[PDB]
Nucleic acid binder design. Sequence first.
DNA 1: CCCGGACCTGTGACAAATTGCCCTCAGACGG
DNA 2: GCCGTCTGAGGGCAATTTGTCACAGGTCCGG
Length: 211
Amino acid sequence: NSPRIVQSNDLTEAAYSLSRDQKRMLYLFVDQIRKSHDGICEIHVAKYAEIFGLTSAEASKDIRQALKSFAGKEVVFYYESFPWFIKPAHSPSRGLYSVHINPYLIPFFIRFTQFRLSETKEITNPYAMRLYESLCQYRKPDGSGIVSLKIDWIIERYQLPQSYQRMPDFRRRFLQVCVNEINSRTPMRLSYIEKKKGRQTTHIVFSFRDI
DNA sequence: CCCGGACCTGTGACAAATTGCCCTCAGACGG
DNA sequence: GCCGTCTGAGGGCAATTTGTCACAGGTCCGG
Ligand SMILES: [Mg+2]
Ligand SMILES: [Mg+2]
Ligand SMILES: [Mg+2]
Ligand SMILES: [Mg+2]
């Protein structure tokens, strides 16, 4: 009953910094690209508003600001870096935007991760979108999984801001909040435990199930 | 023994950013 | 052919959430 996003693990594990609104758009580009290709995609205001339950007005504000914040953003596959866009976005018709994704990214978009788009569209924090994508990469058909993520690798790939290198801030402003959104906003039920070595906490062990 | 120091934890404050809302007004279209 | 309506491109808001750092309070190490 809703679009099935699929993506290469290389994207699930890439290093980048995107907002919620930018990540939302990114799912549709990947959907458009995959159903086929030169890299030219399109986004309609009225569709976006309906997909994510926004008004037309607030949808228009989100697309425009997301689009101008792509400039200078870069993507790293672990390493090799690429720009997302190679030409500015533009509007041929009122309510329509046309975009030029870097055609060299295609092979990185299409050993894979998959999720239905309704699973993530109510999540607000972009780091919690990242965590839920990384967990889906390990999900079994039946709907459960278990994975150990290294703390430095979380910090390197999700590009956490610098103060989350102090572990008490990492717990309070990233881990607990994102485990709670997932438990409150997705059909997943998530638990975790800390792996320690000496005084330092080194990994987080995630277990999850489906409702 | 106890010190100062280097680690670690959690919490109170405040700053910066983001959220869904609200209001204006001209574009595109059809009847 | 004009206008009424549906859109969406602008401009804003206060309430919450996210990002930063000082200080309280624990351990062990080496002198
Ligand atoms: Mg918004
Ligand atoms: Mg004393
Ligand atoms: Mg006390
Ligand atoms: Mg002390």
